[PDB]
Amino acid sequence: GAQRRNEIQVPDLDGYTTLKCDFHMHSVFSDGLVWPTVRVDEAYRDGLDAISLTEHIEYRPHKQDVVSDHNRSFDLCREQAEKLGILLIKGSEITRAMAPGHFNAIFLSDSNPLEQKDYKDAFREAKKQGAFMFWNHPGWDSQQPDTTKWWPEHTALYQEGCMHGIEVANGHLYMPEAIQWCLDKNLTMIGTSDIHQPIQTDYDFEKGEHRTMTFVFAKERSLQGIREALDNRRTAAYFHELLIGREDLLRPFFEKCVKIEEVSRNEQGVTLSITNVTDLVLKLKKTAHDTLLVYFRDMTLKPHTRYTVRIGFKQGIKGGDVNFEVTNFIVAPDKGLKYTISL
Amino acid sequence: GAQRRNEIQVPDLDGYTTLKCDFHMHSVFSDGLVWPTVRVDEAYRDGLDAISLTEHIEYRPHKQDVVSDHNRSFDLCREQAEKLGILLIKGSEITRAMAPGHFNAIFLSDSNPLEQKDYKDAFREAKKQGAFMFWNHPGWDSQQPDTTKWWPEHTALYQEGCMHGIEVANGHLYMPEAIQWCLDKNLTMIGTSDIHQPIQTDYDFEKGEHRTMTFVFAKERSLQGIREALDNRRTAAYFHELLIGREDLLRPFFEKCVKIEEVSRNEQGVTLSITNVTDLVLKLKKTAHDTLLVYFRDMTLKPHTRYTVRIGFKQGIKGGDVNFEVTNFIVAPDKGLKYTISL
Amino acid sequence: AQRRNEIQVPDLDGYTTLKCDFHMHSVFSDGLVWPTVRVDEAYRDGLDAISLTEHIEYRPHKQDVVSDHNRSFDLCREQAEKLGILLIKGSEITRAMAPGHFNAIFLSDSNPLEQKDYKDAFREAKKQGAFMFWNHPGWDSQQPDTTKWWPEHTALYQEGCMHGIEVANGHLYMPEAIQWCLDKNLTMIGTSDIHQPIQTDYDFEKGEHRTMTFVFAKERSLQGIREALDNRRTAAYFHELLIGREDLLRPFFEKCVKIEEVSRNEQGVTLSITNVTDLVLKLKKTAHDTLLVYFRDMTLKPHTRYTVRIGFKQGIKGGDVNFEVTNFIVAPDKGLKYTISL
Amino acid sequence: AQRRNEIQVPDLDGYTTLKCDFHMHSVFSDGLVWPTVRVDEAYRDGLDAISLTEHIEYRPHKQDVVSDHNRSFDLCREQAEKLGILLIKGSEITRAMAPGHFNAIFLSDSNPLEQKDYKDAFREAKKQGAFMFWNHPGWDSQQPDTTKWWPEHTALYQEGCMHGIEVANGHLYMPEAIQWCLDKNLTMIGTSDIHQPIQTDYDFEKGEHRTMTFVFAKERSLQGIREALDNRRTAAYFHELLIGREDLLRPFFEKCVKIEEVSRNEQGVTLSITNVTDLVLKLKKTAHDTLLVYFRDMTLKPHTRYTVRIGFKQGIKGGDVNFEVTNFIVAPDKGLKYTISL
């Protein structure tokens, strides 16, 4: 081997360790285009901590050639995953017509029983295994071409205990309708690649792109750690430049992303130095404020960059709230995180 | 020398030649950080056709060291510009407090007379030279920190014949308020770099970024050609992934950006092949349509890439209007170009 | 979503320069991608032809990938066609050294090459009139100290079972093979032998490219490619090196540079030299008239115009501007010699 | 908006590796950027120290850039300080060959080096106790055929006016200078001699870096740097090459690689070799026990862990895994020799 890892530099919330996970992907054992061990190589290289090779149960177009059961791609990844310190969550993709559409069952013990005639029996087996289940690409236009709706089956599934999360972001597809669903129904927001091609084929790493993924705030770096995080919705989806999650999580995360220090002060205002200590670009937009409190209208804090920020005091003011939205920290559809720097 | 040019691959409107211009930049002869010939090297390399080194009249912080008049940086660029086939428009930046703020006077014959005590006399000299004049960075938060307004002086200036355009985009600053101004007041939409640093220092070319600039649709590649285009508002600002301009210009431009061909048809629908023949990424978003006409919800046509697009016919339909907004072809603030592919 | 990155290199007079990769693997042997991926990659890299050459003898996925020796090729035909990629059927005869490993291309059937005796694997290929070349002769796993030519190789060569040698494979450069081809009248080949996804082995961010072969053909067809290979109308493109016989490399260089006299006086000449290609060209001054003053070394970056001055000392009025194109290998440790006569 | 790209290279025991560029220009001579830009660039490139060394004799912008010889340095002090960049005052004595061009650094005043006789320019620098080195000895504009050592150079050297030679300048590599330093007990230096904006001459997209000097110091201070230069505790970092005396390069390599024995049996040993640096390392097998079977050639990419197997043939139980670190130049055309004893 020739092993190189590019760590994903993001912080940890107090009490938790931030794990980078991809809970949805494919190999040639379904409709994917790579041998399963490649998914392990890619995760390693990309600084991921955990993955789930979630083959389609119902869709295996290579089956005349690639002859196996539903547990086989997982089996093939185990040694590699161990050697490279990647956590491997057994899972599968229950692929059906809309509704209910496509769901992933992860933390399975056995994939085979998920092959059933009736979709309902498919979900009953996964449930029986106590699987963590989430709705995939609700918004995929192939199944919902005009509008991303919630069907009576999703309601059923959700009441049966067969929906624990929803993908709010899949590959290059962002689905805000799902954000509101997770908020209203108390579900875990998920983000995955749903990779079929080689990873490099779908992400222009050259341009600093990254695979859509999920930040999991775990009490420990183990299978159980991840599961407990997911059970408790202690996640955020990382998509392009967006980070999607509950405010109660994004707020403290943002606080860890920047190092704000008062460099100076006087009668005329305050001088700060704000440093982005992450790999994540941060985009700030001024919000309602005291007009006598003079600062930026817009501001982009690039990764690992320190900025000098002057806040002016007009008329007589001695301080105040430097208010802004972190536009790319999505706490609700079309709503970015609100933050204040009190001076 | 060692000369390499990276052409900007965009089309030409019928009757016109598309020229790529930067009408606002700086050298060490004001507050810029490079020798003037560098601006010529950069333009060449970046596939530009024309530039204007527009030094501040009032602000020259290097003056103890760099001793000259206001025509000198232009003078120094002439030979290089000629050798490299770059068109050099003499200009300057009338730098004042808000209001009226900062304006560029281009197509000057002599920069020196623009140095006057009263700003009004500054504009009267530029006018006297029949200069093409535009308002710079109306939105720059340093001078308008809370809101981008139109002052009574801009009204005056505009009625005196001292405003022919407005920058709708400056460097990494997008100012939509200006779009509406140009639309209401019939002005030329401009986009510039306002470069002070070396060009590579402010644009991550690695990530395929490009200097903010202006597409000028000229009847000829000459100084007069450009001037006639500008006089007639035959421009579009190119900013990041956005192209900003009047619909009557963007519509036919988009039509030249894609090559749509019907690959096939039947009772079930139509198969198209759409190719982006430009360096510009194109972003399509489905709009109001016949629901029986099944197609994408969202779609990104990357540069120089061919896509196969299937349009389905539900119930009995034999065709219709494949409607979508080109979200990054801005025809009005917050309003993208509307387009239809009739089948 | 299809995007092609054309390889901008010139055409010699009377021929079309085809970019080909005659050695590669998929899951159907010991590669790591579905076969259709090799066609996609080829299209994207601006290639014209490929051969998916699965090992006959080494199929470590066969318990899962149950198909025969013809299957990966079969699975690529449609795609190749849709994307304009010529698909040459081949296989890799994979044995112990000697003879080592050989590619057999322009096959009609891969299945019969599965034989107990290596010589029978070769007779089957020969019976199909295959174009056969010796792979990675220098691979350290089989020749760990010296790249040697073995009796088995003489014999295969004498039996009409060696038409080419790989001079470059992946990231491995094997000069010993250059001399062999030169001495034996064989086709120098450059291939990738890709097993990983292509992007995993080549850093395209850095201007790297798959090792490949420039094939100078009379037509963009399977038949056109074969006639070129049969007659050694090839060059191996490896990293920054272009490797081939001098009678090809010389006119090729000529086509890579646009030289113009911009000016002349008593003091010398000013030339403009433009590199109209994607290839970097490295020049180094060789023996010359010392009164003819020019560069010592010079690198011509792709698609870049250079202004070059030649001084005339004492009373000289002209002369031979002599240099070596160091990355244009015409023989082991020998670059193309060239003159600009002024 | 400040972003620093640290150069990740190791520290030798007892010293701190400083990255320095002792040769560069601005608009105050024949460079093309305002001086403050050189400080910004240095910070961004992960450098620790620079010297803006304007030509004394060649100031083609002086009709516009009217200031004295101390001014560009002066203009950079504040910025340098704000950004933690050590600023060494210097100038370039720019003459015809011989003696050619020399940098004088650790100056107190640049103004007095402006003299009619070159020897007086040097006496002024020497009077200030400057560290003096010969620039681009191999520059083809002044030595177009051969890089020669001239009597003027012997004389400057004997007069205590040559403490170093540039072995690497910008994109120019000059091996002749390596032997000279070795023979004369001088400091090998690598500089950029940047005139353009830095990005214009280096393709960072491709992993290129400014030519520079690794300085092994006892403190991150002007005084620390000087003591290092005085005692030749340097290496020149040029493209993929690191050039320096063997007594520095050997422990430096040792620090670049983390070697571990992962396993051993009768059949051999499996090692893991990690390159913990930003530097690419190129290994080539040298003379060895032929019963000790290992790689022929191997390239260790930055921040990459390699699994390497050493086979034991016949009855061998261990041995010397001998190779050359080809990009670690200890002498002209000589790479660092190294052994891993198993």
Ligand SMILES: C[As](C)(=O)[O-]
């Ligand atoms: C994006 As799929 C074919 O895994 O549903």
Ligand SMILES: C[As](C)(=O)[O-]
């Ligand atoms: C952005 As300016 C200092 O040219 O107004």
Ligand SMILES: C[As](C)(=O)[O-]
């Ligand atoms: C490099 As191979 C396994 O094709 O001999």
Ligand SMILES: C[As](C)(=O)[O-]
């Ligand atoms: C390369 As120079 C003009 O500093 O001698």
Ligand SMILES: [Zn+2]
């Ligand atoms: Zn799938």
Ligand SMILES: [Zn+2]
């Ligand atoms: Zn799915």
Ligand SMILES: [Zn+2]
């Ligand atoms: Zn899927």
Ligand SMILES: [Zn+2]
């Ligand atoms: Zn300015």
Ligand SMILES: [Zn+2]
């Ligand atoms: Zn301004």
Ligand SMILES: [Zn+2]
């Ligand atoms: Zn300006």
Ligand SMILES: [Zn+2]
């Ligand atoms: Zn193989």
Ligand SMILES: [Zn+2]
């Ligand atoms: Zn092989």
Ligand SMILES: [Zn+2]
């Ligand atoms: Zn092979």
Ligand SMILES: [Zn+2]
């Ligand atoms: Zn110079």
Ligand SMILES: [Zn+2]
């Ligand atoms: Zn010099």
Ligand SMILES: [Zn+2]
């Ligand atoms: Zn110099």
